[PDB]
RNA sequence: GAAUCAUCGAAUCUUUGAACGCACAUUGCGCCCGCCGGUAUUCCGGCGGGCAUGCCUGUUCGAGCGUCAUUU
RNA sequence: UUGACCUCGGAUCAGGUAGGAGGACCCGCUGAACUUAAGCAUAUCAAUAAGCGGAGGAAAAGAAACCAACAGGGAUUGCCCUAGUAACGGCGAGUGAAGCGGCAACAGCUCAAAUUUGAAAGCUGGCUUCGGCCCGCGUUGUAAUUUGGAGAGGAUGCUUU
């Protein structure tokens, strides 16, 4: 019958791999993602610490540059770049690390979640490197990390770590050491009983 | 960090997840063509030490070769072929290096950083420059790059006494008869 | 070489030459066909025409009872006192559009 | 599908306005304004889902239902209490002459036996009052701007304005003119 | 001996179809019409629609090979793919919430929404299309009709309240440069409305304005394309407004004033600085305009035709002369109803009109308040 | 959801297409010839494809891995007189 | 300002040939943009600009239940 | 419905690039036989001849995972000597270096591995009034610092543009 383009055909089939294939403990905690209530408040926090874009930072250095032609505090902002959160990490100055969960070099992240358990910084993985990149003011990003925060906002910073760090920790906490997969539909049962 | 992360994992490549991995990758590669463009490399790690940089001019292309036996052997490696067949391909290209991604039953699967000589990019950079210059035409063809000192033994020692500056150039050197004026 | 700062409240309440500077006379292409111009208003539009234009009242309920654009003349005469009685005309716009429609759907014959 | 947060918004949302509402109502009922009666129009904005029975009961009286509706008011006693009562959905203030003219020329229906019919004719405008004195649109508009004994039955008869929605262009005394040409 | 074909030859070569084209062209259809009627281009009618396609029908209609080719060589094509882009950017913007970047691109956009103005530069296609400025006043007619009719309407989605309020700005100066220079000529009304003709350098220009009363909308219309004839005619009028004040030496754009024109000064809110039998017919004379009559259209034939003084009352518009009647000044009062001061003359629109045009002093006695008015005639 | 249908129809179309379109004997010599033993064997066979998901996996993909999982052990002379002896048939 | 002069920084540079619109053993056959002359908006003939491949960067367009969301 | 991110493609889109030639010298692949051993098969011829690919005015090599046992030397390269020594060999034919020493020339460096994180500070293209405006690349990492006979960070006080 119809014939489906090579990519097309290839990109389900990896899909169909993907789900079919039993899963290492890494991919597989990377394929358990978390709530969205969750996801929404991180963003909230997120996007009222978004990085200044180029616009801005530009018409500021403006700003201060007229000022000095004719007395602040260090920015708080959220931190973006893989070698960079993992410095931070390591060093111990992250309160939470967000994870994008489509990594397409997926060993980028592999030690990312462990690293941080053992750190003891409270992570999560969200779904998007695509609404990581729009976090910060980019394409994309495999990572986010957020160190510390102004005053107003020390309340929600403690309180969303403390949700996650239970309702999402513990969650995937209890099962995260097995192997995933096991998919297998009716054809794929009923080939499996005759082979 | 990240990058020692890596290379720890390239290290214990015959773990559990790097065995998954490269399995995956090997069916996709074996369902892709035998040599295709990469934008982003597959160990960024290795791109890196081996000098991949994130800028204008830079690709990675992925090849797959055969491997095997030519009992006589043939003499270039599997790599070396990967990156002629690759300058064949793009010869606007410039190799400027090569390291083993995947291997399989029948086919050895190589990724190869080139570099664009015709960028201006490339041209201002004062670390490129120097593979813009007109010498290193087919690096690979001519067996400059590692692959080909590693095939060529340009090492130091009495172990490589007989190549350490040239096989035939040493050949030639100790069998020719050199005349004086004053004999 | 860099323009001194201003806020965007003063760019915001921040943000003509002749056509013919340099004009010579040019042919017309023979290929080229000009829109005919509209007819001029004919004494039958006025308000209040001589009682001879004045139609009959059956001829008036057999104009509305016909269908539109079955009518040779879109319009028959009535006659007002004053012009507070003159009403704006239903077709107005409709008739605008129907003629830049005539001029850019409808082909031009020499 | 709908969601706690929204039923907590919508809680407190309705607590705030039951709490302001007891407060008017315990306070004298004053406004800042001179005795005078004054002439102003009022365009409601969706500011609150669901609306407390008094200021329903108040947007019945002054029929601003469908979405974008405007009309003209009398600025008395009762009148104020009733907007100082409706005050989150309501955006009130002094019209303009040539405001108050271009809204009824642009958009301008009449009410007849419960029938909404533009203001094309001043016959028809004639068939509709006639005897009370009005003798056209202008007229009309004249008894407005100056507010005469025949105001009550001239709003009635003039159909609630619906100004088109804006693109983005309390209190406040004259913006209202922007605002019309802004949605008009 | 060459064997040529029937089909490739002939009128097939020089007549394309609409769809065909379209297709050449590469364009949707709303931007294809809007691109043909920016540049005047007209179907026409092939000889033989046959031979110019075998495969054709009545309805079908063809287009201009050379048309097509000066369609594909303007740069607003250039310029839309441009523009498209740039509805591209701000969607990205405003997808990904970068507020501050969405505004700088609207910024870039230029809309004429918070514009008034043409979205796009149209000087180039009109300079091609108008060689003389003889045929702008030739396509003057519709201009000032068309834009006169916006200036009436309301607003809507196409065409913004900002763009009508400069709409109607233009008319005024329009109607300020008229009665500056008495072109005015001849003034008709009928149950469609106003028609003015106006003598321009010896070029006869008519215009239809209707009265002022809520219009109807009801049917099918199309405000997209009714939207850009506004920019064709807006611009047009603009650039001629500016040629017209050159050429008398006053300076342009006239100044109008912000709150008088808020009150409602309508056209007394601009004001005209010279330096940067019309006349003789009501040269020395006072008129009052009544609460019923036509304010603007008494107000432009009165200042074109060189009646120095004219008031009206207070609510039909500000800055005026003395609202009282009872102010002796007032020769003649228009009154249209179903004070009597002896020296003031009770005089109609009717009055005016037929002595307007007629050039004579048509009798006040016939043209009396309260008895049957002579039926007029046409000028034309 | 379950991808079922899209697995069928991809083995379907994979159908569609195939229609369109001595180590074994070495070892056992190996065994009974006192050279190998059994723990000698299970060393051999913990192999570089040891763990190989083999059920729930596609039809296609399983082909695949089966066409490029052989590895290239010694065989004899014995062995091949072995197998031909075996499959020469009456 | 001569020269079968010297120098030489500026031009012209026919068909082929790595040979590049297709064919090549035809001064043959094609398609897009423009012009010219001869009854010429249609017919004919000629002329100018063009039309190889693989790859790199950028621009534009398209496809993909691969994938993210979007009730404040 | 809409808009991303990723991947895969088309365009007679814009800017470039690869052929071929030459091949005396150079860098690789591939690679004989005649002959000698008074026959001949290992060996020799020869890691040559032919064939294939790739540059320059030189190429290549090159700054030790070196030489050495020193009272140490100190990137690579070429000559003399080492030397017909060591070592290998139908121990027959034969093959056959290297350290050291005297010279000629002599020049050292760039990265990956770090967090700029109190601010991607970096770069491509087109648009120009040529001064500065955008677009895109890019955080899956472009600038500055650093490369193990080192270095970083502070303190410290001198000296250079």
């Given at each position: 019958?119809?014939?489906?383009?090579?990519?097309?055909?290839?990109?389900?089939?990896?899909?169909?791999?993907?789900?079919?294939?039993?899963?290492?403990?890494?991919?597989?905690?990377?394929?358990?993602?978390?709530?969205?209530?969750?996801?929404?408040?991180?963003?909230?926090?997120?996007?009222?610490?978004?990085?200044?874009?180029?616009?801005?930072?530009?018409?500021?250095?403006?700003?201060?540059?007229?000022?000095?032609?004719?007395?602040?505090?260090?920015?708080?902002?959220?931190?973006?770049?893989?070698?960079?959160?993992?410095?931070?990490?390591?060093?111990?100055?992250?309160?939470?690390?967000?994870?994008?969960?489509?990594?397409?070099?997926?060993?980028?992240?592999?030690?990312?979640?462990?690293?941080?358990?053992?750190?003891?910084?409270?992570?999560?993985?969200?779904?998007?490197?695509?609404?990581?990149?729009?976090?910060?003011?980019?394409?994309?990003?495999?990572?986010?990390?957020?160190?510390?925060?102004?005053?107003?906002?020390?309340?929600?910073?403690?309180?969303?770590?403390?949700?996650?760090?239970?309702?999402?920790?513990?969650?995937?906490?209890?099962?995260?050491?097995?192997?995933?997969?096991?998919?297998?539909?009716?054809?794929?049962?009923?080939?499996?009983?005759?082979? | 960090?990240?990058?020692?992360?890596?290379?720890?994992?390239?290290?214990?490549?015959?773990?559990?997840?790097?065995?998954?991995?490269?399995?995956?990758?090997?069916?996709?590669?074996?369902?892709?063509?035998?040599?295709?463009?990469?934008?982003?490399?597959?160990?960024?790690?290795?791109?890196?030490?081996?000098?991949?940089?994130?800028?204008?001019?830079?690709?990675?292309?992925?090849?797959?070769?055969?491997?095997?036996?030519?009992?006589?052997?043939?003499?270039?490696?599997?790599?070396?072929?990967?990156?002629?067949?690759?300058?064949?391909?793009?010869?606007?290209?410039?190799?400027?290096?090569?390291?083993?991604?995947?291997?399989?039953?029948?086919?050895?699967?190589?990724?190869?950083?080139?570099?664009?000589?015709?960028?201006?990019?490339?041209?201002?950079?004062?670390?490129?420059?120097?593979?813009?210059?007109?010498?290193?035409?087919?690096?690979?063809?001519?067996?400059?790059?590692?692959?080909?000192?590693?095939?060529?033994?340009?090492?130091?020692?009495?172990?490589?006494?007989?190549?350490?500056?040239?096989?035939?150039?040493?050949?030639?050197?100790?069998?020719?008869?050199?005349?004086?004026?004053?004999? | 070489?860099?323009?001194?700062?201003?806020?965007?409240?003063?760019?915001?309440?921040?943000?003509?030459?002749?056509?013919?500077?340099?004009?010579?006379?040019?042919?017309?292409?023979?290929?080229?066909?000009?829109?005919?111009?509209?007819?001029?208003?004919?004494?039958?539009?006025?308000?209040?025409?001589?009682?001879?234009?004045?139609?009959?009242?059956?001829?008036?309920?057999?104009?509305?009872?016909?269908?539109?654009?079955?009518?040779?003349?879109?319009?028959?005469?009535?006659?007002?006192?004053?012009?507070?009685?003159?009403?704006?005309?239903?077709?107005?716009?409709?008739?605008?559009?129907?003629?830049?429609?005539?001029?850019?759907?409808?082909?031009?014959?020499? | 599908?709908?969601?706690?947060?929204?039923?907590?918004?919508?809680?407190?949302?309705?607590?705030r306005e039951k709490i302001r509402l007891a407060r008017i109502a315990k306070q004298q009922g004053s406004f800042?304004?001179?005795?005078?009666?004054?002439?102003?129009?009022?365009?409601?904005?969706?500011?609150?889902?669901?609306?407390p029975?008094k200021?329903?009961?108040?947007?019945?009286?002054?029929?601003?239902?469908?979405?974008?509706?405007?009309?003209?008011?009398?600025?008395?006693?009762?009148?104020?209490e009733?907007?100082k009562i409706?005050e989150?959905?309501?955006?009130?203030?002094?019209?303009?002459?040539?405001?108050?003219?271009?809204?009824?020329?642009?958009?301008?229906?009449?009410?007849?036996?419960?029938?909404?019919?533009?203001?094309?004719?001043?016959?028809?405008?004639?068939?509709?009052?006639?005897?009370?004195?009005?003798?056209?649109?202008?007229?009309?508009?004249?008894?407005?701007?100056?507010?005469?004994?025949?105001?009550?039955?001239?709003?009635?008869?003039?159909?609630?304005?619906?100004?088109?929605?804006?693109?983005?262009?309390?209190?406040?005394?004259?913006?209202?003119?922007?605002?019309?040409?802004?949605?008009? | 001996?060459?064997?040529?074909?029937?089909?490739?030859?002939?009128?097939?070569?020089?007549?394309?179809?609409?769809?065909?084209?379209?297709?050449?062209?590469?364009?949707?259809?709303?931007?294809?019409?809007?691109?043909?009627?920016?540049?005047?281009?007209?179907?026409?009618?092939?000889?033989?629609?046959?031979?110019?396609?075998?495969?054709?029908?009545?309805?079908?209609?063809?287009?201009?090979?050379?048309?097509?080719?000066?369609?594909?060589?303007?740069?607003?094509?250039?310029?839309?793919?441009?523009?498209?882009?740039?509805?591209?950017?701000?969607?990205?913007?405003?997808?990904?919430?970068?507020?501050?970047?969405?505004?700088?691109?609207?910024?870039?956009?230029?809309?004429?929404?918070?514009?008034?103005?043409?979205?796009?530069?149209?000087?180039?296609?009109?300079?091609?299309?108008?060689?003389?400025?003889?045929?702008?006043?030739?396509?003057?007619?519709?201009?000032?009709?068309?834009?006169?009719?916006?200036?009436?309407?309301?607003?809507?989605?196409?065409?913004?309240?900002?763009?009508?309020?400069?709409?109607?700005?233009?008319?005024?100066?329009?109607?300020?440069?008229?009665?500056?220079?008495?072109?005015?000529?001849?003034?008709?009304?009928?149950?469609?409305?106003?028609?003015?003709?106006?003598?321009?350098?010896?070029?006869?220009?008519?215009?239809?304005?209707?009265?002022?009363?809520?219009?109807?909308?009801?049917?099918?219309?199309?405000?997209?394309?009714?939207?850009?004839?506004?920019?064709?005619?807006?611009?047009?009028?603009?650039?001629?407004?500016?040629?017209?004040?050159?050429?008398?030496?006053?300076?342009?754009?006239?100044?109008?004033?912000?709150?008088?024109?808020?009150?409602?000064?309508?056209?007394?809110?601009?004001?005209?600085?010279?330096?940067?039998?019309?006349?003789?017919?009501?040269?020395?004379?006072?008129?009052?305009?009544?609460?019923?009559?036509?304010?603007?259209?008494?107000?432009?034939?009165?200042?074109?035709?060189?009646?120095?003084?004219?008031?009206?009352?207070?609510?039909?518009?500000?800055?005026?002369?003395?609202?009282?009647?009872?102010?002796?000044?007032?020769?003649?009062?228009?009154?249209?109803?179903?004070?009597?001061?002896?020296?003031?003359?009770?005089?109609?629109?009717?009055?005016?009109?037929?002595?307007?045009?007629?050039?004579?002093?048509?009798?006040?006695?016939?043209?009396?308040?309260?008895?049957?008015?002579?039926?007029?005639?046409?000028?034309? | 959801?379950?991808?079922?249908?899209?697995?069928?129809?991809?083995?379907?179309?994979?159908?569609?297409?195939?229609?369109?379109?001595?180590?074994?004997?070495?070892?056992?010599?190996?065994?009974?010839?006192?050279?190998?033993?059994?723990?000698?064997?299970?060393?051999?066979?913990?192999?570089?494809?040891?763990?190989?998901?083999?059920?729930?996996?596609?039809?296609?993909?399983?082909?695949?891995?089966?066409?490029?999982?052989?590895?290239?052990?010694?065989?004899?002379?014995?062995?091949?007189?072995?197998?031909?002896?075996?499959?020469?048939?009456?």
């Amino acid at each position: 019958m119809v014939k489906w383009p090579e990519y097309i055909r290839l990109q389900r089939q990896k899909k169909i791999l993907r789900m079919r294939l039993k899963v290492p403990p890494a991919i597989a905690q990377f394929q358990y993602t978390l709530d969205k209530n969750l996801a929404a408040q991180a963003f909230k926090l997120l996007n009222k610490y978004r990085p200044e874009t180029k616009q801005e930072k530009k018409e500021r250095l403006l700003r201060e540059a007229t000022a000095i032609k004719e007395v602040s505090k260090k920015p708080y902002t959220v931190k973006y770049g893989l070698n960079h959160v993992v410095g931070l990490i390591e060093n111990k100055k992250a309160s939470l690390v967000l994870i994008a969960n489509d990594v397409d070099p997926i060993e980028l992240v592999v030690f990312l979640p462990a690293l941080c358990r053992k750190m003891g910084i409270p992570y999560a993985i969200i779904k998007g490197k695509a609404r990581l990149g729009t976090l910060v003011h980019k394409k994309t990003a495999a990572v986010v990390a957020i160190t510390e925060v102004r005053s107003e906002d020390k309340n929600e910073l403690a309180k969303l770590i403390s949700a996650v760090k239970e309702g999402y920790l513990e969650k995937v906490e209890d099962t995260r050491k097995r192997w995933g997969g096991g998919i297998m539909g009716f054809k794929a049962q009923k080939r499996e009983e005759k082979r | 960090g990240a990058l020692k992360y890596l290379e720890e994992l390239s290290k214990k490549k015959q773990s559990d997840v790097v065995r998954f991995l490269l399995r995956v990758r090997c069916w996709e590669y074996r369902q892709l063509n035998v040599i295709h463009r990469a934008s982003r490399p597959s160990r960024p790690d290795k791109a890196r030490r081996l000098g991949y940089k994130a800028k204008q001019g830079y690709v990675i292309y992925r090849v797959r070769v055969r491997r095997g036996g030519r009992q006589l052997k043939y003499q270039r490696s599997l790599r070396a072929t990967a990156e002629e067949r690759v300058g064949r391909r793009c010869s606007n290209l410039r190799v400027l290096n090569s390291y083993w991604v995947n291997q399989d039953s029948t086919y050895k699967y190589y990724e190869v950083i080139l570099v664009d000589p015709n960028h201006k990019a490339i041209r201002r950079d004062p670390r490129i420059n120097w593979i813009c210059n007109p010498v290193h035409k087919h690096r690979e063809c001519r067996g400059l790059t590692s692959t080909g000192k590693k095939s060529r033994g340009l090492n130091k020692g009495h172990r490589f006494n007989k190549t350490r500056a040239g096989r035939r150039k040493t050949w030639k050197r100790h069998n020719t008869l050199s005349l004086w004026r004053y004999r | 070489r860099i323009l001194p700062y201003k806020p965007p409240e003063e760019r915001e309440r921040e943000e003509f030459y002749d056509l013919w500077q340099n004009e010579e006379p040019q042919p017309p292409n023979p290929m080229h066909i000009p829109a005919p111009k509209l007819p001029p208003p004919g004494y039958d539009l006025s308000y209040n025409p001589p009682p001879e234009y004045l139609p009959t009242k059956e001829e008036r309920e057999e104009w509305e009872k016909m269908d539109p654009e079955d009518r040779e003349k879109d319009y028959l005469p009535t006659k007002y006192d004053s012009l507070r009685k003159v009403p704006a005309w239903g077709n107005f716009v409709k008739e605008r559009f129907e003629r830049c429609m005539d001029l850019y759907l409808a082909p031009r014959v020499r | 599908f709908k969601r706690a947060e929204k039923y907590v918004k919508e809680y407190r949302e309705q607590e705030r306005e039951k709490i302001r509402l007891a407060r008017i109502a315990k306070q004298q009922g004053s406004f800042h304004i001179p005795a005078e009666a004054k002439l102003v129009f009022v365009i409601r904005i969706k500011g609150i889902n669901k609306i407390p029975p008094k200021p329903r009961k108040i947007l019945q009286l002054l029929r601003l239902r469908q979405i974008n509706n405007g009309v003209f008011v009398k600025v008395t006693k009762a009148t104020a209490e009733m907007i100082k009562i409706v005050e989150p959905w309501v955006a009130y203030g002094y019209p303009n002459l040539k405001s108050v003219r271009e809204l009824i020329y642009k958009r301008g229906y009449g009410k007849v036996n419960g029938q909404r019919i533009p203001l094309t004719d001043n016959a028809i405008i004639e068939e509709n009052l006639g005897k009370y004195g009005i003798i056209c649109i202008e007229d009309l508009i004249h008894e407005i701007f100056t507010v005469g004994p025949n105001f009550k039955q001239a709003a009635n008869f003039l159909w609630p304005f619906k100004l088109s929605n804006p693109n983005g262009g309390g209190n406040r005394e004259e913006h209202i003119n922007a605002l019309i040409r802004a949605m008009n | 001996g060459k064997a040529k074909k029937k089909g490739k030859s002939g009128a097939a070569r020089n007549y394309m179809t609409r769809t065909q084209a379209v297709k050449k062209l590469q364009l949707s259809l709303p931007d294809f019409r809007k691109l043909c009627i920016w540049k005047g281009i007209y179907p026409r009618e092939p000889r033989d629609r046959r031979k110019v396609n075998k495969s054709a029908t009545a309805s079908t209609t063809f287009y201009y090979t050379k048309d097509i080719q000066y369609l594909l060589h303007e740069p607003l094509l250039q310029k839309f793919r441009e523009q498209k882009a740039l509805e591209k950017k701000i969607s990205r913007a405003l997808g990904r919430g970068d507020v501050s970047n969405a505004a700088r691109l609207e910024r870039n956009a230029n809309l004429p929404e918070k514009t008034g103005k043409p979205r796009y530069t149209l000087n180039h296609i009109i300079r091609e299309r108008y060689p003389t400025f003889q045929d702008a006043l030739r396509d003057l007619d519709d201009c000032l009709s068309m834009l006169f009719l916006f200036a009436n309407l309301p607003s809507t989605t196409a065409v913004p309240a900002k763009m009508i309020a400069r709409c109607e700005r233009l008319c005024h100066e329009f109607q300020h440069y008229l009665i500056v220079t008495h072109s005015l000529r001849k003034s008709f009304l009928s149950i469609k409305g106003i028609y003015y003709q106006a003598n321009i350098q010896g070029e006869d220009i008519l215009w239809l304005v209707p009265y002022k009363f809520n219009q109807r909308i009801v049917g099918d219309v199309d405000f997209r394309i009714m939207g850009t004839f506004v920019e064709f005619y807006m611009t047009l009028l603009g650039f001629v407004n500016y040629r017209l004040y050159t050429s008398i030496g006053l300076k342009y754009p006239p100044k109008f004033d912000q709150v008088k024109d808020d009150q409602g000064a309508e056209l007394a809110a601009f004001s005209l600085e010279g330096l940067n039998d019309p006349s003789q017919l009501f040269a020395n004379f006072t008129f009052f305009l009544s609460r019923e009559t036509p304010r603007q259209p008494l107000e432009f034939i009165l200042r074109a035709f060189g009646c120095k003084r004219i008031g009206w009352d207070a609510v039909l518009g500000e800055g005026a002369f003395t609202t009282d009647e009872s102010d002796p000044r007032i020769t003649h009062q228009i009154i249209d109803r179903p004070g009597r001061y002896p020296g003031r003359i009770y005089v109609q629109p009717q009055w005016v009109w037929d002595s307007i045009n007629d050039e004579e002093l048509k009798p006040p006695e016939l043209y009396a308040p309260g008895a049957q008015l002579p039926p007029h005639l046409s000028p034309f | 959801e379950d991808g079922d249908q899209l697995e069928r129809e991809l083995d379907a179309m994979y159908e569609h297409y195939k229609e369109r379109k001595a180590e074994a004997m070495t070892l056992a010599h190996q065994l009974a010839t006192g050279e190998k033993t059994k723990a000698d064997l299970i060393d051999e066979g913990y192999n570089k494809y040891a763990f190989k998901q083999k059920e729930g996996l596609p039809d296609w993909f399983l082909e695949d891995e089966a066409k490029h999982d052989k590895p290239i052990k010694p065989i004899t002379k014995e062995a091949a007189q072995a197998i031909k002896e075996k499959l020469r048939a009456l």
